[PDB]
Design a protein around this ligand. Structure first.
Ligand SMILES: [Zn+2]
Ligand SMILES: [Zn+2]
Ligand SMILES: [Zn+2]
Length: 96
DNA sequence: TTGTCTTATCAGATGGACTC
DNA sequence: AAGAGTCCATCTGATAAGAC
């Protein structure tokens, strides 16, 4: 039940936090950082997944999922198909 | 019960569409 | 007409949760 504490949006291409760790949508997060006040009111080339919280690009400029993109950056080799975990994983990130 | 490694989820950078 | 500024999606980079 995540919600932008400024505008009330429940959907956004990227969730962000303010200095205190209060959640803000991408729009309200960028605005506050820039202005210092409140904002006024596809599939992976490697593993063929259609679901990720963040699309990245490979060296040729084609889309890869977050997992595949990060794996390649680290290892300089493509993510093997056997690494692909079923389901969606989430993590409780702490403040600051 | 600790250590490693994958990769979610945060933060920063870039630039197209739009207004001024 | 031609430049600077606003806005915010979407990209790259940083941090670190928790799978295993
Ligand atoms: Zn918002
Ligand atoms: Zn706040
Ligand atoms: Zn992938």
């Amino acid at each position: 039940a995540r919600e932008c504490v400024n505008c009330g949006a429940t959907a956004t291409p990227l969730w962000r936090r303010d200095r205190t760790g209060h959640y803000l949508c991408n729009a309200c997060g960028l605005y506050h950082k820039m202005n210092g006040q409140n904002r006024p009111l596809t599939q992976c080339t490697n593993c063929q997944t259609t679901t990720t919280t963040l699309w990245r690009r490979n060296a040729s400029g084609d889309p890869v999922c977050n997992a595949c993109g990060l794996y390649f950056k680290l290892h300089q080799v493509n993510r093997p198909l056997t690494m692909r975990k079923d389901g969606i994983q989430t993590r409780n990130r702490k403040a600051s």
